[PDB]
Design a protein around this ligand. Structure first.
Ligand SMILES: [Mg+2]
Ligand SMILES: [Mg+2]
Ligand SMILES: [Mg+2]
Ligand SMILES: [Mg+2]
Ligand SMILES: [Mg+2]
Ligand SMILES: [Mg+2]
Ligand SMILES: [Mg+2]
Ligand SMILES: [Mg+2]
Ligand SMILES: [Mg+2]
Ligand SMILES: [Mg+2]
Ligand SMILES: [Mg+2]
Ligand SMILES: [Mg+2]
Ligand SMILES: [Mg+2]
Ligand SMILES: [Mg+2]
Ligand SMILES: [Mg+2]
Ligand SMILES: [Mg+2]
Ligand SMILES: [Mg+2]
Ligand SMILES: [Mg+2]
Ligand SMILES: [Mg+2]
Ligand SMILES: [Mg+2]
Ligand SMILES: [Mg+2]
Ligand SMILES: [Mg+2]
Ligand SMILES: [Mg+2]
Ligand SMILES: [Mg+2]
Ligand SMILES: [Mg+2]
Ligand SMILES: [Mg+2]
Ligand SMILES: [Mg+2]
Ligand SMILES: [Mg+2]
Ligand SMILES: [Mg+2]
Ligand SMILES: [Mg+2]
Ligand SMILES: [Mg+2]
Ligand SMILES: [Mg+2]
Ligand SMILES: [Mg+2]
Ligand SMILES: [Mg+2]
Ligand SMILES: [Mg+2]
Ligand SMILES: [Mg+2]
Ligand SMILES: [Mg+2]
Ligand SMILES: [Mg+2]
Ligand SMILES: [Mg+2]
Ligand SMILES: [Mg+2]
Ligand SMILES: [Mg+2]
Ligand SMILES: [Mg+2]
Ligand SMILES: [Mg+2]
Ligand SMILES: [Mg+2]
Ligand SMILES: [Mg+2]
Ligand SMILES: [Mg+2]
Ligand SMILES: [Mg+2]
Ligand SMILES: [Mg+2]
Ligand SMILES: [Mg+2]
Ligand SMILES: [Mg+2]
Ligand SMILES: [Mg+2]
Ligand SMILES: [Mg+2]
Ligand SMILES: [Mg+2]
Ligand SMILES: [Mg+2]
Ligand SMILES: [Mg+2]
Ligand SMILES: [Mg+2]
Ligand SMILES: [Mg+2]
Ligand SMILES: [Mg+2]
Ligand SMILES: [Mg+2]
Ligand SMILES: [Mg+2]
Ligand SMILES: [Mg+2]
Ligand SMILES: [Mg+2]
Ligand SMILES: [Mg+2]
Ligand SMILES: [Mg+2]
Ligand SMILES: [Mg+2]
Ligand SMILES: [Mg+2]
Ligand SMILES: [Mg+2]
Ligand SMILES: [Mg+2]
Ligand SMILES: [Mg+2]
Ligand SMILES: [Mg+2]
Ligand SMILES: [Mg+2]
Ligand SMILES: [Mg+2]
Ligand SMILES: [Mg+2]
Ligand SMILES: [Mg+2]
Ligand SMILES: [Mg+2]
Ligand SMILES: [Mg+2]
Ligand SMILES: [Mg+2]
Ligand SMILES: [Mg+2]
Ligand SMILES: [Mg+2]
Ligand SMILES: [Mg+2]
Ligand SMILES: [Mg+2]
Ligand SMILES: [Mg+2]
Ligand SMILES: [Mg+2]
Ligand SMILES: [Zn+2]
Lengths: 112, 229
RNA sequence: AGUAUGAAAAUGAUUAUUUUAUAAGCAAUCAUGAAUAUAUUAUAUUAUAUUAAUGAUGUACCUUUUGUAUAAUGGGUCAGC
RNA sequence: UCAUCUGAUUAAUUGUGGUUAGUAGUGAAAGACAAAUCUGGUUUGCAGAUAGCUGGUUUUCUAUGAAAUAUAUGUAAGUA
RNA sequence: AGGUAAAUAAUCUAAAGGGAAACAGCCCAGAUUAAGAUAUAAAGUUCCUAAUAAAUAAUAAGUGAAAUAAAUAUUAAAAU
RNA sequence: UGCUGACAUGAGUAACGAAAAAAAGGUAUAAACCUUUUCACCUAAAACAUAAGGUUUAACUAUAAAAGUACGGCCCCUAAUUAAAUUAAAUAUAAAUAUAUUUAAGAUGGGAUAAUCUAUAUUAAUAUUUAUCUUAAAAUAUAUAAUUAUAUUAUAUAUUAUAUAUUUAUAUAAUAUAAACUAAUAAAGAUCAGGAAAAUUAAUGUAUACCGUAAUGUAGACCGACUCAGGUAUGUAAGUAGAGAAUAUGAAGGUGAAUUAGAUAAUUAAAGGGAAGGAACUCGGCAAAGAUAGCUCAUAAGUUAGUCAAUAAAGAGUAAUAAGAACAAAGUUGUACAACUGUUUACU
RNA sequence: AUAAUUGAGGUCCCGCAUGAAUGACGUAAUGAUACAACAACUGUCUCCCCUUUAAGCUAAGUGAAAUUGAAAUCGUAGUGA
RNA sequence: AGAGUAGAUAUUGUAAGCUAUGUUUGCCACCUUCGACUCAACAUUUCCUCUUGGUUGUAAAAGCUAAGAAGGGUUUGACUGUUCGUCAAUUAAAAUGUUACGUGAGUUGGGUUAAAUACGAUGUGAAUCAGUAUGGUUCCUAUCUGCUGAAGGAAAUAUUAUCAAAUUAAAUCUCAUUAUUAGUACGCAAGGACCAUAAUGAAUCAACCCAUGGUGUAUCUAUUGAUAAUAAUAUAAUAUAUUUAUUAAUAUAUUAUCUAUAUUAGUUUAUAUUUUAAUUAUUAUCAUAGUAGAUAAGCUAAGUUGAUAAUAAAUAAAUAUUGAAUACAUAUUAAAUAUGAAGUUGUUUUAAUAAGAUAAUUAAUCUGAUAAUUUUAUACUAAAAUUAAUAAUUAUAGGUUUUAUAUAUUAUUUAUAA
């Protein structure tokens, strides 16, 4: 149930790093994407090219934003009177700074 | 009960409902991204549904047709955005696949998602129309788009097309009128070139497309095999 | 819980040298090859240093006891007190 | 916690506030409870209580080097 | 009884070193520090393991060869 | 088992706390945030109103809006109770203090008027607990004033038509569902016999103070060291069903979560089914299994006479005959001990 | 009573060491009390099998604990606090 | 000594004698949990099975006693907490121990056990007991050793792909009944064989799923309650087209089936009024998979199939031959020569290892791995299958097609037509 001794430096290290099962393997199965000449996984789509195509689809197949007439044709002063500004909470501010906590996809290296 | 399908870490009732939802979403949006295991199971359902619809369309037996219809109805959630999904299935989706013997979907593997390391895939409908009757482009048929992008890249590099690319193009063609296929390719080029910001001289692009079509369509050792002494 | 400074140790990762995949026990000491490093008197057949070839000897430390390798006490390690 | 079980118009359950406790209350009485546990709480002080008992008591070198017996002891873990 | 109680001697206790396979108390012998030629102690001298050659008898059972198991039985052997 | 600090070991191991998720888009930044659609879960709640509490957690700093009427506090009044207060000498007392009496405080309670909308100031003058039956009345049908059977029976409002003050008032007549529920009324059964305390006319007034108000509240926003399956007061709690607040469903509302994706060995947990047998298991039938109406009938021995036994066991009617939601309902007996309903070691 | 009973009930009385409000005795009712029997039922068992979900296993992210003189931590026999 | 009809030594064996054991009850004081379940390992002082000596007390058959022998096997129930014991029913037999009286970081907790309580006894009493009874508390994610499986690395008498012997590590090894020989041998009769073979079983082990049984959150049908859809039809509105003389008629698309007021306070329902405010087909969700009847694959035992591994060799106790030493005798603790066991060696089976063997040898396609689709396999791994698309041949998974199975209605039918 309980360790009888302080496990030594040797014995913890040979346990962890000695076996190949536990080690990380080289990703030999990279290959060139045909659409953009960059690294991608074998038997896998290029995340750049499919992303680009998804973006294209979004730009074309776009549901139009609903802008109400009455709010679109308000005067500036009138709009300010109706819908004044406010102090956002700390939480709200944190939520707004998305680049702080949201990871955008990185581009791979160009294949040789 | 064991081995017939993926369990997907869900109770039976939930699992089936999930699969139905995935099928509905595939029919609505002609491609969808999801986890690999879910996509694989969803394909099985969607394909089955398509075949049933085809059978209903074709069969002379009225009772059979009614039974197929009932089965199709059972296998979908018809509400909200999928109210007129049955109609779409009979009129829009299933008529694409009348000549095609199975294989109506394609699950294309993606790079696994970063937060979760979950293997990610794209379940999508085969031979989805890239251009509707309105002057727009349609959401779906990712593989075709990728192929055309690869072709464009090859043209830019002034390289020959890869054998695999040609094989894929041939596969795409098999259930496609040649002129229609060409027109689709041309349409894809217009969007793709603009996105990538390469110049679109139209006549030259058309000629290239024609050349690509021609080679696709017109079909043309270490050990020796010797009889026993 | 001042301010500077900090190659103090425990501790982690990495690199170098050296030994190690037929060998068994306080992991040290003594014998003794080999390999490496440094050496403005290596003149060399040289000198020091580092390193579990191989051989021999070797039952942690304290406390408490007639008596403890004891499977009796107490201590995870180092720093300060 | 889940299942199962018991009471469920009564010696019922329960909200809000009040009274009674550290030789000391409350107790359909089990030494039961009195702020995560009482044959009598907690805190502060006497206070460095006391301990014939346990453990600990830190550099080096040099010289000599025991005893575990007798007697006594409310003494046989001690002390002369 | 590795028991208990005292008597005498020794060792251990507080004693390292050699021997007794390993060993608090047995057999030798008392470490001031080295050196390693010579005498050695107890104990050893086929190899493991430092060191050996002989003589005369007996055993044939591996008896025995560093921890001796009895009455009795059988088979011999001497002497009368 | 020294104290403090720092850093190891177990170990990148267990675990990440009852849980249903999917896609598309915000965004070629999302398992976790927002939106839309689908799916599910809670639904006499995981909803909607509130009380208490609390690092304001909120839909936020440009912030929770009150003269009063199905608005609370504050205020007036007092209960339980409290008070270095109160009375040459209230009484007692080593001091502290304690007692009695006064006065003051003290909500958990009582407190005028109001949609016709309503006016609170000042001055002057003399209600334990339970029940709504039976009878009687008239109404509706059958038969031949009287019988039989059935509901109805105190209050709650609009309409129409009359009669009196003069379209505004008062009274009368007639018209008009069922089932729950409310308040207010009346009469009244039982013993356990049911709070306290604070006037009326007239004249003159009344420019209406302060505080509470977010959200959370069967909970991530309180008490539990934690965003803890524990603890936490009250009122509504769509319909369909039913005796019902049981049980099923779920209109609406809310929610789907600081872990995910896969795989589903051994093994564990929590479930479902099981041939032939049926307690052979085991300390022990522990556990599991077992319900042939839940309504209406019917129901024994014994017995303290109490359908106590009884919700008796069996059994019948209605329903169903191959079965086909949940929930209520789980035998009979002998003996020991204790009359019984209760109480007890909060945590063996 | 059971194929078979140290249990149960009935009965006997060398009551080691019963007995009358530390109440004695026999009942009806009650009891989540204790023991025993019958019925019914069954995965309790003969004798386990299949299935379901949550873990377990793998990948990603986060990240405990008791313990620990130091460890280069085998079997047997012998020895020996 | 003495029993044993006679004779101490077939069998029995007083009291006294000499040992072994460490299985009981003690003693010592170095040293501070009984039973059940589960799985067992070891011993032999052998209970059964195999071999054999003796047995006026071996005629036969049952026995009794002794030697070899640990290969295989050695019980299920009633009572009790019990081990034990009593009994019942079996068995070839129901052996005796050791293993911290094996086994609680494997289960249990009935006994023993503290707090509550009562009884009998003891005590003035608090309370007590080699008493009785009811109740009643420990948990642990495994670091090392070890064991069960599974990988990676490695040094290979030097490579890879395959086939692989000796060997090592384990497994296995049986037993009963009936039948025949034979109612023979033997015996007055009663009774009744050895030697040996066969067939049925047994207990154990292994594999398997064709069939049978179970399961089957694949599936299908039935079915109660509530809710929610799609389609069709009707009505209404809007939008888009066509006709007609913005209106009406038609076609397509989308949305809608609400609402409000009455019946004396509130809620619900009902009807009436108001409004365009619909009733058939087919689905789904929830209620343990809602319940029930079937049920494919797989997995399984209740099922099926096979095995209990020979022949051979050397032996144990025991039984002999010739034959001295020792004129006889003596199977030899002499030389020679023979028999002899469920034991030993082996044999058989599994796992490991890889001596050896065949082939190829820097590669337009050498051998492996990474990758994908997977299952023959599986925790992860590993293993195995496939990764075809060109001059030919090769289907891994899904999908498709197919026949087949399941479900449950169906000739009162389906399809072609005249
Ligand atoms: Mg369900
Ligand atoms: Mg299905
Ligand atoms: Mg080596
Ligand atoms: Mg080692
Ligand atoms: Mg140790
Ligand atoms: Mg120690
Ligand atoms: Mg320690
Ligand atoms: Mg009453
Ligand atoms: Mg007591
Ligand atoms: Mg406390
Ligand atoms: Mg207490
Ligand atoms: Mg003092
Ligand atoms: Mg002190
Ligand atoms: Mg003393
Ligand atoms: Mg001296
Ligand atoms: Mg002395
Ligand atoms: Mg003394
Ligand atoms: Mg002694
Ligand atoms: Mg001493
Ligand atoms: Mg010495
Ligand atoms: Mg001395
Ligand atoms: Mg000296
Ligand atoms: Mg010998
Ligand atoms: Mg010896
Ligand atoms: Mg210290
Ligand atoms: Mg671990
Ligand atoms: Mg693990
Ligand atoms: Mg885990
Ligand atoms: Mg997104
Ligand atoms: Mg309910
Ligand atoms: Mg007052
Ligand atoms: Mg109040
Ligand atoms: Mg509030
Ligand atoms: Mg509010
Ligand atoms: Mg709320
Ligand atoms: Mg909570
Ligand atoms: Mg708090
Ligand atoms: Mg806590
Ligand atoms: Mg309801
Ligand atoms: Mg809803
Ligand atoms: Mg809420
Ligand atoms: Mg969670
Ligand atoms: Mg059964
Ligand atoms: Mg049956
Ligand atoms: Mg039993
Ligand atoms: Mg039994
Ligand atoms: Mg039970
Ligand atoms: Mg009667
Ligand atoms: Mg019930
Ligand atoms: Mg009672
Ligand atoms: Mg308790
Ligand atoms: Mg009896
Ligand atoms: Mg019994
Ligand atoms: Mg008397
Ligand atoms: Mg008396
Ligand atoms: Mg009494
Ligand atoms: Mg009671
Ligand atoms: Mg992880
Ligand atoms: Mg020693
Ligand atoms: Mg005689
Ligand atoms: Mg004798
Ligand atoms: Mg002993
Ligand atoms: Mg023997
Ligand atoms: Mg015989
Ligand atoms: Mg054999
Ligand atoms: Mg034991
Ligand atoms: Mg153990
Ligand atoms: Mg242990
Ligand atoms: Mg109990
Ligand atoms: Mg054999
Ligand atoms: Mg089968
Ligand atoms: Mg069958
Ligand atoms: Mg089957
Ligand atoms: Mg009303
Ligand atoms: Mg309508
Ligand atoms: Mg529900
Ligand atoms: Mg002769
Ligand atoms: Mg002879
Ligand atoms: Mg043999
Ligand atoms: Mg290929
Ligand atoms: Mg295939
Ligand atoms: Mg082919
Ligand atoms: Mg296929
Ligand atoms: Zn690319």
């Amino acid at each position: 149930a309980v360790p009888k001794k302080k496990v030594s430096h040797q014995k913890k290290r040979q346990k962890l790093y000695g076996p190949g099962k536990k080690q990380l393997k080289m990703i030999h199965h990279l290959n060139k994407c045909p659409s953009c000449g960059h690294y991608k996984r074998a038997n896998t789509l290029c995340m750049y090219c499919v992303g680009q195509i998804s973006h294209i689809w979004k730009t074309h197949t776009a549901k139009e934003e609903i802008k109400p007439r009455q709010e679109e044709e308000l005067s500036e002063l009138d709009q300010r009177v109706l819908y004044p500004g406010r102090r956002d909470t700390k939480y709200t501010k944190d939520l707004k700074d998305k680049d702080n906590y949201l990871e955008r996809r990185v581009r791979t290296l160009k294949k040789d | 009960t064991v081995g017939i399908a993926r369990k997907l870490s869900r109770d039976k009732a939930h699992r089936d409902a999930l699969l139905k939802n995935l099928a509905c979403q595939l029919f609505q949006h002609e491609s969808i991204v999801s986890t690999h295991a879910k996509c694989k199971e969803a394909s099985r359902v969607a394909e089955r549904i398509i075949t049933w619809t085809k059978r209903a369309i074709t069969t002379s037996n009225s009772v059979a047709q009614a039974e197929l219809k009932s089965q199709i109805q059972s296998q979908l959630f018809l509400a909200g955005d999928n109210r007129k999904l049955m109609k779409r299935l009979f009129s829009e989706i299933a008529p694409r696949y009348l000549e095609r013997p199975g294989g109506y979907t394609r699950v294309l593997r993606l790079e696994p998602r970063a937060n979760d390391s979950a293997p990610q895939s794209v379940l999508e409908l085969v031979d989805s129309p890239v251009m509707s009757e309105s002057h727009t482009v349609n959401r779906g048929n990712l593989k075709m788009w990728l192929l055309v992008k690869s072709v464009i890249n090859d043209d830019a590099n002034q390289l020959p097309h890869n054998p695999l690319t040609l094989q894929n193009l041939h596969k795409v063609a098999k259930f496609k009128a040649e002129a229609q296929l060409h027109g689709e390719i041309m349409l894809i080029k217009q969007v793709l070139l603009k996105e990538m910001s390469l110049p679109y001289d139209e006549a030259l692009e058309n000629e290239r497309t024609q050349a690509l079509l021609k080679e696709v369509y017109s079909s043309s050792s270490s050990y020796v095999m010797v009889p026993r002494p």
